[PDB]
Every structure is written in C-alpha cells, then in structure tokens.
Design a protein around this ligand. Structure first.
Ligand SMILES: CCC[C@@H](C)[C@H]1CC[C@H]2[C@@H]3[C@H](O)C[C@@H]4C[C@H](O)CC[C@]4(C)[C@H]3C[C@H](O)[C@]12C
Ligand SMILES: [Zn+2]
Ligand SMILES: [Zn+2]
Lengths: 196, 763, 50, 44, 195, 227, 110, 150
RNA sequence: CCACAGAG
C-alpha cells in the first residue's frame, strides 16, 4: 500500500516540436543483442503535406551486383524510406536524469516505408517512349486528391543531419524544467465526470 | 415485507413512461426535433447561375410552431380528419433569408407544405391529454397511436429489419467451395457493396464499379502498405497454416510486376468503369477509387492510408480463417447482425429526396425568371414558392398512402412499406404495431431466416408469427425491449484513446495480432494490452452515467478482439446487474419504487439495471431466478414472461401447451370479435365487428393487465363440458346451446361504410 | 393429439376463481398454481379435479 | 417502367390461356360453403 | 433422469479431457452427440414405459390411444411424464450464441438441460429455456409444413402430365395415346391394386 | 430419403447427393480382408503417405524431394510401391510433367525436377503446392469408404462416389451383386433393364422407409414409363 | 520458398539470369543471394495421423513355417510367422502374409 | 552487416500452439483471464521498474509515455493552463511491487502496452528559411502507457 | 393492372 520512493514527472519542451520515425523494415533486435542504427545520408521534409523522406546508402561490397542496377535502374545505390507524419496527442518522449523523469511532447509520428523512385522513373520513361511514338469552373478535386496534388507540386526542403545534439537538448530541457513546480487545482473526483 | 421475487414490478414502471409503441413514437419525435434541422443544414444554400448575386438560404425549420406566437397553430382533430377524409398534418414553417434587390431581407414563417403528423407524437394534439380532453376530441384514450391518417385511411409504417450496415459478414459456399466476406457500406452519398471472395484458391476483391476482380495484394499495396512482409504479417500473423494458404496471393503480385504504390494505383484505376466528368489521370482515378469507392463508409482525407489498409487486412484475415476451417463463419441470421429501421428514418430519407427535388425545381424557376432582364425586386421567393410547396406535401401523402417508396437519389426501391391498420380488435390493432418485416420475401429456404434462432430470447416474440407462407418472416417485438438510437462516435474514440487504446498509426503491424484489438462499429481503432480490465472499466463508466447507456462493449475471444457498438437499430433488453452473487436491486429499492418515487430511469442512473443487446448478451451469464444465482453470474432477468409478446400474453398458461398451439392462438386472437375502442360508435370504418356483451377473462395474465386488454375484451366466458354429446362435435366442431344464444351468448354486429363523392366536373 | 394441458388448467383455475369470486392469474412461467385451485374447489364442495 | 403484355405473355404462365382458361376454367352451377358434420346423413 | 444426467456428465468430462473413444468412426464431437442422444432417448423411453404401465383403466388418453381414434402412447408420455429431447434438423439445439445455446448456461457446455432436453412434463409446466427450445421445434415443424407444399404440388403436376395418356386397352396391354405399348401386361399379371 | 429423393429419382439427374455404392465381399467374415479391400477402392492421397514435400535448389538444378515411408504402407497394407507412386505422379494432368523427370533416390526419396526469367520458381512453387493433393492409389470419384456389418455378421463396403464399374471390377469385390442407389450409373453400366430395376427398387425403398404403403404396381408402371 | 528481403521486405524470386545459376533475386530493390556451395530448402511437414491397423496382432499363437527371408544382410532366421488370408476373388489362389522372426520386414505371396 | 543482409525467414508458428507461445514471443523481445491479467500486471510492473533503473543517466535512451490527452487542469502562477510546464506528478512505487502515477491529485495505473518489433528513434526538428536542421536525439527503447484509475 | 391482408 504505502510508497517507498517517488519518481517525479516534469513536463517541458512545449515548442521544440519533436518527431519520431518508425522504420517498418528493420527489426529492433537481432538475436538478443540490440540492432545497429543505419548511417544517414540525406532527408527531406515537405512542409504542407508533412512527408518525410530518408535516404540510406546501402552496402555495396556484397549482395549487390551493380550490373543490374546500371542496366535498368541507372545505377541506384541508396534506398529511400517515405513516411507520413500523423498527429498523435497524448504522446511524450521521456528520459531519466538523476532519478528524475523528464517528458517532452511528440508532435507527429512517421511510419517510414520503403519507396522506389527509380521504378516510377523507368515507368514514366517507358510511358513517354510508347506515348510520343504514336498518338493513338475547372476545380473539382477534393479528398485525398488535393493532398496528393499538394504533395506533388510542393517544393522539397533539403535538411541537415546532426548527431550528438542530445547533450545540448537535455540541458535546454532541464533548464526549461527546473524553474517551475505546479500546484493542483481540482480534486480527483472532478476528473471522472468529464472525459475520464 | 416485500421480497425479491416481486421484482417484476419493474415491468409496469418501465411501461409507465416509455410506452409500448415507443418504437415509432421516439423515432418520429427524433425526426421532427433533429433530422429536419440536419436536412436543412445539409443544403440550405441556393445560388443562381445567370445572376451570381441572388442567394437564398434557409435558417431554421419547425413543424406546427409559428415564430411570432408561442402557442402552436390550430390542427384539425384526428377523428375529424378520419371522418372528412383528409390527412392529419401540420404546416412546415421555415425561416428564409434572401435578397430583394440589394436588401438582405430576413422573412419568417413561409409554408413549404403539410407534413403528416403521426398520432400521439410530441407535435400531435393528443400528447399528454387527459381522458376528458381526449373525449372532447372524439378519440379513444386507449389507442396506441403511432399511425398516420392520410386521405381518411390510417396507415402504419412497419418496422423494417435489414442486415447490419457497415459490418463484415463472412459466408461460405461448400457445394461451390467459395468463401467470401461482404461489407455493405451505406452513407449519405452512396450505398455500395464490397466483396472479398476466394476464386481458384486466390483471394480476390470485387466491387460493382470495378470491371475486373483486383488481386488482394495489388489493393493492399495501393492502400499504403508497400512492403509484402507487412502484408503477410497483417493478414496472417505468426501462424503456419494461414501463411501456407496466403503465400499464393503474395506470389500473384510478383507475377504482375507490381512493386510500388503508383503501379498498383494505376493498375486499379485502369479497371474503374465509372469514368466521367472530365476524368483525371489513371493514377488519380485509382486514388479516388481506393479512397471512396472500395469501402465507402471509411473515407481517407490525408495521405495516410492506414485505417483503410487495416480494414481490408482484417477482412482478408477473416477470409483466411474461413479457408482454414468453415466453422468460424458468422451467421447471417444472427439477431446481433440485424438492425431495425424505424418510421422516423424512412420518413427523413423520403423528406430528404422531396426537399432536394423542391429546391432543384425552385432554383430552375428562379433562373427561368431572373435570366430575363425585366426583373422587379429580384422576383421575391414567397411569390413563387407555394406552387412548389404543394409538391412536398403531395409527395409525402402519395408515398405514405400508396405504400410505394421510390427514391432515385439513393437508388432505392421499396414496396409494401405502409399497411392499413387492421381494426378487427383492440389487440389486433396493438399487434399490428411492434411488427417486424424481414428484408426478403422470395426465398423459401427452410432452416434459414424462417427458423426461430435462439438468439432472440427476450428481444423478439418466441410464439407470435403468422401461419402460412410468411411463417417466420414476419416477427413481433417482445414486451420489454428498446431499440437504440444513433450516437456520435468521436467522443467514444477519445474515451478509448484515454482508457489505454494505442492508436493504429503508432503501433507495430507485425505484433498487432499478439494482443487484443479494439473495433469501433466494426472498424479497427487500435490495440489494447489488457482487454478484460478495459472492458470492465468501460462497463463501469457506462453504468455510472458518464457515457450513453446504449453503447455496447463485448469481447470476442475467437477473433481476439473487443467490439464497441454505437449505431442505432440494435434491439436491446433491460436486465438487473448481479455482482458478487447478490442482486444489485435490494428490497429497499423495490419499496421505494412501489411507494411512488424512484422510477425506472432512477434505476438506470444508480447502476441497478442496464440494457444489453444480443452481442452484449453473448458475453454475459444471466440467471433466471433468485434460486439460480451462483457467484459466476453476471446478470439477472427481471421477469421471464417478457419473452412472449403482447398478443402471446393473451394465452393462459402458455408453458403447458405445445408451441404450435400457442402460435395458432397468436395468429387467431387478432380475428376476435369484441370492443374496438371507447369511441367505436363515433367511427365510420369500412368494416367493423362489435360484440354486444363482452366479458373479462376468468383467467387473466400480467401481460393482459399491462396492455389494458382487460378494459376492452373480445370474447365471453362459456360453461363448457368436455364430453362427446353427439355425433356433431367430431373433428373440432362445437355444440352450441340454443337458449344460451337466445339470451345473448355470442351476439355480434357488423358495421359497413358506403362512401360517395359529388364530383364537381370541369364543365 | 394437440396436448393442451393449459386448457384444463385454465378451466380449473376459472372454476375456482369464480367460486371464490376473484379473478385468477395465469401468467406465463408462473401464475396461480393448481393445488390452490383444488383446495378452493374442495372447500366449495366440488371435485378436486373439476 | 411497367412491361407490356404480349401474346407470349398471354399464352404463358399460371394465368395464361393454356393453364388458366384451357386446362381448367371457372364453371357454372357451383357453390362454395363452409362445412359442418351430420352423422344422421348417409355416407352417399 | 438423474442417472441419465450423471452418466451424460461423465461422458462430457471424458470428452473434455480428450480420452473419449470414437467407436463409430466419426470425430469426438459427433460420437459424443450420438451417445448423449441415445442416452436421452433411452431415458425418455423408460420413463414413458413406466408411465404407461402406471395408468389405470378408464384413463381417457389411454383409452383414446388403445382405440387408435386420436393420439398415441408418445403423446400421453409427453403430457404425464418427461417430454424428451427436442431435435432440430436431426441434431440437438444449435449453438445460437458463441459456442453455447442460451446465455443462461455457462460457456462451453454440453449438458442435456442446455442442449435442448426438457425434463418437465407438459402438465408440470416448462422452464423458460425448455419453453424456447420447444418453440424452436414447433417453429421448424410449422415452417416445414408451410414450405413442402410448393415442391410436392410441382412434382405431382409433373407426374400427372407425364402419365395422363396411359390406359389399359381391351387386349390387356397398357398403351400410350399414340398406340405404343409401355407394358405388355400391367405389372406382369394384370391385377388392379384396387381389387 | 424423402421429397428430395423422389424429386431426384423421377427427375433423372446426372449428378446427385449421397451416391452410395454398396458392395459385398468374397471374404466377408474377416476384418483384415475388409480393410485391405477398402484400401484398394478408397483413394489415398500423397499427403497420407509422405512425411514431407520440400523444394531443393542445387547449384544449377531445381527439384522437389518427397519422402515416402514404407512404414505407413506396411501398416495400412496398401499394395503400393515407390515406382507406383512415381508413375502415379506421371499420370497427373494439371502439373503437365512429362514422364521422364521423376527419379528415385534411395528407397524412399522421389525427385521431381523442373527445367527451363522467373518461370522456374513459379512452376516449381505450383508443383510444390499441388503435389501433396495427387491421387496415388484408388479411384478418383470415390470420396470415402466405410466397412459396415450386416445383421447376420457378414461385412460389406459402402463407398460414396460415382465409379460403379471401377468398384465392381476390382478384385476381391463380387461383381455380380454390387449395386448403387444412383440410377444413371446403373443405366450406363448395366443396361436399360437394370436401370428400370434400380428405379423400382429405389422408389420402393424410399416409399417403404416412411411406411406409406404404396402398391408396387404403380412403381413398376412409373419405371416402365421412364425407361 | 518463403524468403523475405532484408532491404525492402519483399518476396525473393529465384531467377537464372542467363549464365545458368539460380539466385535469390529481388525485383523491388538491388539485392540477391547466390546459392553456391551450401544449398537451400523449404520443407513443409505434412501431418502424421494415426490410421487404422490391419495386421495388428495377426500372428499370435500361430504356426511357424520354414521359408527363406529376403533380407540376408541382417538376419539368418529361417522360421517365419505366417497367416493365410483370402484377399482376391474365389477363383484365384489364396494369398498369405508371413514375416521374419528377427528383423520383421513382412512380405506376402499369392 | 553479414546478418543484416542475410535473407530473413519469417516467424512461423504452428496453429495448435500459437496461443501457448504468445507469452514466449512477448517475453523474448523485451477468473482465469483476471488471474492472467494480474500476472501480466505484476510482471510488467517489475519490468518497468527494472527498465527505469537501467537507463539512469544514460545517453540516447528514451521511453514514450502514453498519457491522457486531457490532463488535469491547474492554476497559472481560470484559464486552466492547457499547455503544461514544470513538475506535474510522480511515478510512485509501493511495497507490494506495484506502481502508480500521481498526476497532480489524480492517481493512475501504469503498464507497457503493445511491444514493438522495429527500431525507433526520437528526432528534434527546427524549421526556418535561413537555416534548417534535423537532429537524432537518441533511440526509443520501449513504450509505456498510463491509464486513469476509476 | 399490381400489392397487402387473412382462410384451408
Ligand atoms: C467434379 C464433379 C464431377 C462430376 C460432375 C462428374 C465426374 C464423374 C462423372 C460421372 C462419370 O462421368 C460416370 C457417368 C457418365 C454418364 O454419361 C453420366 C453420369 C455419370 C454418373 C457421370 C456424371 C458426372 O458427369 C460425374 C459424376
Ligand atoms: Zn528487396
Ligand atoms: Zn529376417
């Protein structure tokens, strides 16, 4: 019944706008050991459509045989993962500093899935080849059509990748945290009757 | 002094406020209160095409209430309408805002037609009327109401029964060897059926719009699931036999060289036959087809195609489970898979079609006038609205009277919706209401819809059905039931996410079948770690009163899922909660109820009684008496003889009779000659049978007492001597007494009506 | 052949009720039992089985 | 739209000429009445 | 009926453990169902026999069964003694819920009082589950009576249209309308079944 | 038996439901003989005789290995050998395998090789999924066979299929007293007179099952009409 | 064969190309796995059911004959348990079943 | 890298014992139903306590809280303080090996919820026209869930 | 001309 030790929550980072990707093609663990995070080459974020693209330079010394890739895929050497950032309220990424648990909101969650740009490139080149050889108001699009059109006709923003930022981020979070301690307003019973 | 065995006193109180014919009344009241506002709010705005400055907008609508006067307008009494061969109705008042030249004229109380009121509604003149004022209006106080007086006749919209909308139904054909899963997605725009069938051992998806049967891997790839390992993990999970069945469908996508989302989308869009309206590219047509056409009720807005993909994946998982063994197919005839459409919904749909036609014709006439330059004050609406207003009431009256039901916008064709209320007896008039008509009548499949499934214990009558060709297709509601009402689902979604449901857009696809999944109205909504505690917490919040009591929660262990049902049309039954082997309704509550206070809704508010539908009953364990209570019990029946309907209540000692005799009496008690109503002499009906000296039954029934058959009986008590008096009683014949007939036994009279109209010819 | 024992029970219940002067209830899954009807009929001077 | 009645429609079906007016037809000098027993009447 | 219930419960326990013996060759569920049905039919027959033996003379159903005018031994046994197992489409009552008959019985159960057996007489009144099961049986009887007529009448019409032209000519040969012989003698001996 | 049975007989339908073929045995007073004569007519698939089926890729070859145990053959007393299974595999039409690819490795293993894009994988996957459903011993139309005992103690065999001639031509089954309830098979095997006898017997059995007591002369007349 | 890709998680199609060697090629991404040296295989374990015995205990307290056993690489036994059973039609010779005393391996003659 | 490019064979479990190995698959990566729920609750509470003790002052280590979307309101130092800052609650642990989370004055139950089978990471994003940078803050190692107690 | 509703 009684408590031996309390692990205090501490909410901060209301403007940092953190994001989390969820790779849909690599296991969290290989064997009982943890897996190895892939090296990161480049990324893109669409502002309007909230699309994420991540490029991973895949291994070339084994199980590649670049002859096929240069034969019909123009020598592709990086695998791309595309994901949609979807809103999920009630999500907090947390860490532990000196037995004190710190939390920060996650704005969106992305499901990165493998994408094949070069297949679409070959398809559109073939379509041009077999279409140009022989011929053979105005606003009605809604629903997901407008979102796809926005994702197409937007302008991609090239991002920069940095590592080791965790120390500065943790320092900023704890500095934004330590200054404030809050006092309760309503009783427990007042929580039940309205969206428990 | 009181005991628990007299808990049956909850039954009269339940009938004191709710009413026995509440199924029509509550639906019509809800229609008048809210669906008029919804119908106006859908398409209130009307614009011209020739002069783009004239806008006409309806603001508010009501029936029988003038805005200027607090008192409601005068309506003809129902019996006056019955005699004079009119339609009992109230005008439809609507607020209007339009432009007179440049002036923004707000005008009020313009009549757009007469809406035929249903008797004893909240808009009728017989609402909460004492028997003195009811006698003033030549109306019987012991009349169920709930019927529409049109053109002199009185018609009843019978409660329709359909297969549950927006639900996955899996059926197997063993002689042909095809398993399929069907979803009838019905919404305001379309009502389309999607099939997922198995052909030649491969899972195909077919739709009426699509020309060819799309392979399932193609549509799963097109719906956002690019990788095939994710597809296999979603459909099969960590299982051997399911993967062995399903690997062919993974191979099928590789055979057709489809590997990206664009490829599958254009492959699907090449097959879509409904191209019109200056079509876009094939890829965008396929996007539209996947977004709306394949499953209409789940619409996708953003780029994220997760929920539609998981819906199709769960449907195919059901299909694969059907392939593994054909015993795990849900029964189509199960009561929990059937929903009851009431009069209010059908009237709302018909009014929607009529109002759309009215607005279209009004816009056409306004454009016809305003196209010409000679316009004076923009040709005010109230001058040219009445000739279009008459069409609304003409359509409503014709649709109610003729019984034909033709709505072109929803492509729906119905016949035999309304029936003439049979006034052969008071019990016959009552039993015409609470009658459920099945969806199809052509099929003669024995042991199908006609057989009495055990799932209708206490929800439908177990003995009342007409004998003959319609035996089993026309059913009757039980004495103590309640048909649910439609509720919003987004607050339930938020409550689910609060209570511990992890969303689908943040959980693993591979581990999804390693724990229970939550379904809202048949659509997968997330995953739950502990399903039992979640179910218990949801039940406790329902019983407290923090969410609507008609929301149902039940855990299906075979599918390893937990379902929440919200939509209306589910048939329910109230029951007493028993906890820890003790019934939650003690003797003090019964004494409080009998003393006058603490009505049935107070029993609902304190968590003493609650409503269960069939699916909820599947998860319960109900005891029948106090002696049968064990610590594993979940609910307690209030009283068992509610399983017989209103008509079946006339039979004394029905449990001592063979069931076909009970059914025959249920059929033939509606032809009894007796008193019809308190005002049976002021009525002029086409054929009416009356008895000179009706008598009370010597052996009554509690059902007889509740439905007030005691006040208006049909039949006499006869001193019978069971013996073979002569040869004239052989083969069911009876031997009457001459002196008894002379003194008045069985004396009857018949009243017929001849009508004539002096037509005023055009000459 | 039609096996309607409820008819005999109804007859005896009605006879005992009219002799006692009170209407008797034949509610499904319950109602006034046969033994009380037999007792009332015996106390009124008729046969126990009607 | 109501389908019209053709000659093939007039000759086919349970209400056609062959099964409705030729194989069997309504006859004169007939009566339909409810029955009741009479043991004192001879069997013929 | 208590002995029959106890033996049935023993067989259910043996089936639940798994060591139930499949003598007829079908699977475990089918042989358990067959054994339970046989046991319940036996107990109905035994109680009906002792009931018929225990009825004195001048008992009206017994007299009307001895005469053969109306009723039979089974009807008297059902009214006075245990009614017996209700059978729907050749089997017991189907599981209308999730692997159980009615919500008034515990899940995953095959006891006779839950699968459709009634232990109450028609004189003694029926419990609500027994009432529902008997209602199901009466309903299937009524619907079979209602729907057999169309197929039977169609078959009768087809037979009569096929056989309307045959007649026995004066040379004792059955011939068609077109004067072709079907049988040389009717039945091989030329005897009317009427006489 | 009932209204559907009469409807299915008098309306002579080529395909029926429950087509029981009843066969008497030359040695009807021995359980082992009944079992071994059941083993000839009751079809046994490759899935009942194979431990597994697997697909092996060599360095430049691709084949399918099947492991047949002689233990199940000896325990069931099926008159089946490994080369019999091989030639039975050759008699499959949908697989389209020519009769020179199946080879014998060891005394159990049977190898099915496929020779030539991506067509080889598709072909051998189809063969792997369809191979354990091939018939290796029995009759194609016989669904199942049950050994029954008559009241005098003699044993008979009831099969559910349409292969009347194959059942009555197999050794161990008396070919003079074997009958079936289906009437078109009786016609096509034994002539119009035997078809007439089958019609009369089936209608009489169905009528006497309900105890309706219809005189057999009407049944004989109906049989003479249909034949 | 149910191998799944480690790059894009797709189905591996085995192709020969043109040189004649089978490879676990993937058409969705550049990846394959040659099968040189060790070989790959996918075994589907068919179910093993308990079928009905036919000669279960058919040689108890029976006479023993003197017949040479076909298997002479395991046992040198010359006494065999035999049983006469009518298996064919009545016009054909009566078959018999007999087995070695040491190594089993039952065999029949007609 | 050799196992990363090794072709993956998917998880296969026989149909009869899929439910029996459910606990094993759950444990490998990281009345009757009521007793099972209690057993999972106790094991989960011990696992969460051990996990919290493990990552004390460890870089690139994260756990995701699933908290109610409508937190209890508070007083600004009434606008109800929709956006929160500072210390709000505490993860208290009891003598009986059970855990609870007190947010303000509301006690709530804790658990781990669904367990993931793929790599997760937490990333901070800064968007501006002149400069833009996306930073990998660390790896997300498991997720936990906190539900209101009634 | 249809469709309901009952009676065998
Ligand atoms: C998959 C279902 C197969 C089934 C419909 C096929 C396969 C075997 C077929 C029968 C055999 O051919 C022998 C007969 C030939 C006669 O001419 C007509 C009848 C006859 C009994 C056949 C009917 C039918 O044609 C059968 C049963
Ligand atoms: Zn790949
Ligand atoms: Zn040997």
């Amino acid at each position: 019944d009684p408590v031996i030790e309390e692990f205090p929550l501490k909410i901060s980072g209301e403007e940092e706008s953190l994001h989390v990707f969820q790779y849909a093609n690599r296991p969290r663990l290989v064997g009982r050991k943890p897996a190895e995070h892939p090296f990161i080459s480049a990324a893109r974020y669409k502002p309007k459509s909230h699309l994420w693209e991540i490029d991973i330079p895949l291994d070339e010394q084994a199980f590649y045989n670049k002859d096929k890739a240069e034969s019909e895929w123009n020598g592709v050497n990086v695998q791309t993962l595309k994901g949609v950032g979807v809103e999920n309220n009630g999500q907090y990424a947390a860490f532990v500093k000196d037995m004190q648990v710190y939390l920060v909101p996650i704005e969106r969650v992305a499901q990165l899935k493998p994408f094949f740009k070069y297949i679409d490139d070959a398809n559109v080149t073939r379509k041009q080849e077999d279409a140009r050889r022989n011929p053979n108001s105005q606003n009605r699009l809604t629903g997901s059509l407008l979102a796809h059109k926005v994702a197409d006709e937007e302008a991609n923003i090239e991002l920069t990748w940095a590592e080791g930022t965790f120390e500065q981020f943790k320092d900023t979070i704890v500095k934004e945290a330590e200054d404030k301690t809050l006092v309760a307003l309503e009783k427990q019973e007042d929580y039940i009757d309205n969206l428990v | 002094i009181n005991t628990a065995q007299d808990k049956w006193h909850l039954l009269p109180a339940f009938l004191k406020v709710k009413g026995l014919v509440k199924q029509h009344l509550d639906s019509f009241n809800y229609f008048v209160d809210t669906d008029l506002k919804k119908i106006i709010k859908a398409n209130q705005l009307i614009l011209s095409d020739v002069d783009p400055e004239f806008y006409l907008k309806y603001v508010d609508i009501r029936v029988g209430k003038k805005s200027s006067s607090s008192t409601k307008d005068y309506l003809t009494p129902p019996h006056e309408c019955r005699l004079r061969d009119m339609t009992y109705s109230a005008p439809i008042y609507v607020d209007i805002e339009y432009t007179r030249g440049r002036n923004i004229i707000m005008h009020k109380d313009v009549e757009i037609g007469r809406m035929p009121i249903m008797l004893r509604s909240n808009k009728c003149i017989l609402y909460d009327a004492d028997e003195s004022k009811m006698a003033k209006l030549n109306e019987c106080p012991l009349d169920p109401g709930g019927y529409f007086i049109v053109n002199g006749t009185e018609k009843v919209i019978l409660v329709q029964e359909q297969l549950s909308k927006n639900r996955i139904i899996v059926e197997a054909d063993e002689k042909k060897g095809i398993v399929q899963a069907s979803v009838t997605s019905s919404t305001h725009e379309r009502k389309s059926k999607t099939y997922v069938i198995t052909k030649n051992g491969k899972i195909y998806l077919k739709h009426n719009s699509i020309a060819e049967e799309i392979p399932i891997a193609i549509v799963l790839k097109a719906c956002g699931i690019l990788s095939d390992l994710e597809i296999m993990q979603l459909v099969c999970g960590n299982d051997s036999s399911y993967q062995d069945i399903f690997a062919v469908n993974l191979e099928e996508s590789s055979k057709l060289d489809i590997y990206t989302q664009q490829q599958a989308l254009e492959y699907i869009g090449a097959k879509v036959k409904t191209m019109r309206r200056q079509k876009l590219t094939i890829l965008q047509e396929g996007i539209e087809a996947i977004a709306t056409t394949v499953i209409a009720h789940l619409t996708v807005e953003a780029l994220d195609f997760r929920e539609k993909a998981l819906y199709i994946a769960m449907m195919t998982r059901r299909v694969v489970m059907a392939m593994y063994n054909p015993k795990m197919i849900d029964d189509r005839d199960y009561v929990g898979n059937k929903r009851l459409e009431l009069a209010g919904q059908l009237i709302s749909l018909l009014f929607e079609d009529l109002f759309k036609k009215f607005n279209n014709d009004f816009k056409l006439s306004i454009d016809k006038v305003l196209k010409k330059p000679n316009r004076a004050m923009e040709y005010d609406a109230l001058l040219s609205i009445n000739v279009h207003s008459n069409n609304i009431t003409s359509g409503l009256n014709r649709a109610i009277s003729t019984g034909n039901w033709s709505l072109k916008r929803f492509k729906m064709e119905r016949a035999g919706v309304t029936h003439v209320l049979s006034r052969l007896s008071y019990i016959s008039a009552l039993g015409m209401m609470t009658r459920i008509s099945s969806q199809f009548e052509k099929s003669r499949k024995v042991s199908g819809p006609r057989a009495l499934q055990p799932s209708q214990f206490g929800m439908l009558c177990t003995a009342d059905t007409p004998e003959g060709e319609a035996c089993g297709l026309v059913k009757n509601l039980a004495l103590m039931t309640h048909i649910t009402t439609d509720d919003e689902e987004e607050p339930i979604k938020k409550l689910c996410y609060v209570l511990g449901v992890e969303d689908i857009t943040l959980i693993d696809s591979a581990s999804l079948h390693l724990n229970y999944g939550v379904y809202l109205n048949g659509t997968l909504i997330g995953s739950i770690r502990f399903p039992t505690k979640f179910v218990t917490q949801f039940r406790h919040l329902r019983r407290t009163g923090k969410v609507s009591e008609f929301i149902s929660i039940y855990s299906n262990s075979h599918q390893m899922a937990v379902h929440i049902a919200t939509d209306g049309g589910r048939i329910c039954r109230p029951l007493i909660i028993v906890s820890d082997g003790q019934s939650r309704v003690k003797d003090i509550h019964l004494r409080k109820l009998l003393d006058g206070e603490l009505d049935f809704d107070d029993f609902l508010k304190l968590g003493l009684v609650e409503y269960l539908d069939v699916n909820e009953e599947n998860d319960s364990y109900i005891a029948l008496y106090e002696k049968d209570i064990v610590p594993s019990m979940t609910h307690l029946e209030i009283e068992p003889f509610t399983i017989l309907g209103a008509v079946a209540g006339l039979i004394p000692y029905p449990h001592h009779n063979q069931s076909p005799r009970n059914t025959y009496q249920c059929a033939m008690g509606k032809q009894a000659i007796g008193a019809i109503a308190y005002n049976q002499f002021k009525r002029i009906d086409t054929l009416l049978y009356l008895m000179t000296y009706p008598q009370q039954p010597m052996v009554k029934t509690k059902t007889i007492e509740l439905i007030d058959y005691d006040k208006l009986p049909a039949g006499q008590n006869a001193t019978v001597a069971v013996m073979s008096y002569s040869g004239y009683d052989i083969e069911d014949a009876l031997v009457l007494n001459k002196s008894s007939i002379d003194r008045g036994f069985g004396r009857c009279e018949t009243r017929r009506k001849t009508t004539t109209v002096l037509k005023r010819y055009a000459n | 052949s039609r096996m309607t024992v409820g008819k005999m029970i109804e007859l005896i219940s009605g006879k005992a009720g009219v002799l006692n002067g009170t209407l008797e209830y034949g509610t499904c899954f319950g109602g006034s039992k046969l033994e009380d009807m037999s007792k009332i009929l015996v106390d009124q001077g008729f046969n126990y089985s009607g | 739209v109501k389908p019209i009645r053709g000659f093939c429609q007039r000759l086919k079906g349970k209400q056609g000429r062959f099964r409705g007016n030729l194989s069997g037809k309504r006859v004169d000098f007939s009566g339909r009445t409810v029955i009741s027993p009479d043991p004192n009447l001879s069997i013929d | 009926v208590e002995i029959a219930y106890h033996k049935c419960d023993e067989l259910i326990t043996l089936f639940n453990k798994g060591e139930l013996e499949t003598q007829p060759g079908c699977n475990e569920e089918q042989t358990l169902e067959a054994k339970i049905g046989g046991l319940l039919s036996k107990v109905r027959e035994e109680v009906g026999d002792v009931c018929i033996n225990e009825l004195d003379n001048w008992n009206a159903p017994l007299i009307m069964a001895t005469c053969g005018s109306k009723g039979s031994t089974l009807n008297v046994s059902q009214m006075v003694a245990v009614v017996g197992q209700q059978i729907i489409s050749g089997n017991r009552v189907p599981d209308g819920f999730q692997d159980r008959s009615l919500p008034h019985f515990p899940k995953n159960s095959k006891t006779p009082q839950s699968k459709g057996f009634v232990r109450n007489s028609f004189f003694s009144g029926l419990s609500p589950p027994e009432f529902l099961f008997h209602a199901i049986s009466g309903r299937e009887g009524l619907v079979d009576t209602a729907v057999k007529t169309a197929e039977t009448g169609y078959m009768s019409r087809r037979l009569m249209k096929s056989l309307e032209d045959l007649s026995c000519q004066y040379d004792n040969t059955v011939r068609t309308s077109a004067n072709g012989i079907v049988q040389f003698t009717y039945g091989g001996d030329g005897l009317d079944p009427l006489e | 038996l009932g209204v559907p049975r009469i409807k299915e007989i008098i309306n002579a339908s080529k395909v029926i439901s429950t087509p029981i073929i009843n066969a008497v045995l030359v040695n009807d007073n021995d359980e082992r003989a009944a079992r071994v004569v059941k083993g000839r007519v009751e079809k046994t698939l490759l899935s009942d005789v194979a431990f597994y089926v697997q697909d092996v890729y060599k360095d430049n070859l691709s084949f399918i290995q099947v492991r047949i145990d002689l233990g199940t053959i000896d325990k069931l007393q099926l008159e089946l050998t490994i080369e019999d299974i091989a030639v039975a595999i050759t008699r499959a039409s949908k697989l389209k395998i020519q009769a020179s690819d199946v080879n014998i490795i060891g005394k159990d293993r049977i190898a099915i090789n496929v020779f030539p894009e991506n067509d080889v994988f598709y072909r051998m996957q189809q063969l792997r999924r369809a191979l354990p459903d091939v018939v290796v011993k029995g009759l194609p139309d016989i669904s199942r066979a049950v050994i029954n005992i008559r009241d005098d103690g003699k044993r008979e065999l009831l099969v559910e299929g349409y292969g009347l001639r194959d059942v009555m031509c197999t050794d161990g089954v008396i070919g003079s007293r074997t009958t079936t309830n289906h009437v078109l098979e009786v016609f096509s095997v034994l002539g119009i007179e035997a078809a007439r006898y089958s019609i009369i017997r089936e209608i009489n059995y169905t009528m006497s099952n309900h105890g309706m007591s219809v005189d057999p002369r009407h049944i004989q007349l109906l049989g003479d009409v249909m034949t | 064969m149910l191998s799944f890709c480690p790059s894009c998680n797709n189905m591996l199609l085995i192709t020969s190309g043109d040189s004649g060697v089978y490879t676990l090629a993937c058409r969705s991404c550049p990846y394959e796995f040659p099968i040189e040296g060790i070989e790959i295989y996918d075994r589907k374990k068919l179910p093993r059911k308990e079928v009905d015995d036919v000669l279960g205990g058919g040689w108890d307290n029976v006479d023993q004959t003197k017949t040479q056993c076909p298997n002479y690489d395991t046992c040198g036994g010359e006494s065999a348990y035999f049983f006469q059973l009518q298996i064919r039609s009545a016009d054909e010779p009566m078959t018999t079943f007999y087995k070695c005393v040491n190594c089993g391996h039952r065999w029949k003659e007609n | 890298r050799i196992e990363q490019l090794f072709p993956v064979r998917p998880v296969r479990v026989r149909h009869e014992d899929v439910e029996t190995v459910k606990r094993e698959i759950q444990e490998a990566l990281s009345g009757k139903e009521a007793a099972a729920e209690l057993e999972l609750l106790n094991a989960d509470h011990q696992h969460i306590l051990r996990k919290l003790k493990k990552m004390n002052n460890k870089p690139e280590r994260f756990m995701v809280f699933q908290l109610p979307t409508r937190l209890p309101a508070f007083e600004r130092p009434a606008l109800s303080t929709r956006e929160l800052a500072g210390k709000v609650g505490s993860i208290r642990v009891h003598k009986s090996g059970k855990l609870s989370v007190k947010i303000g004055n509301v006690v709530m139950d804790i658990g781990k919820g669904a367990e993931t089978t793929f790599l997760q990471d937490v990333i901070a994003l800064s968007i501006a026209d002149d400069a833009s940078s996306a930073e990998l803050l660390g790896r997300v190692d498991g997720k936990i869930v906190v539900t209101p107690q009634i």
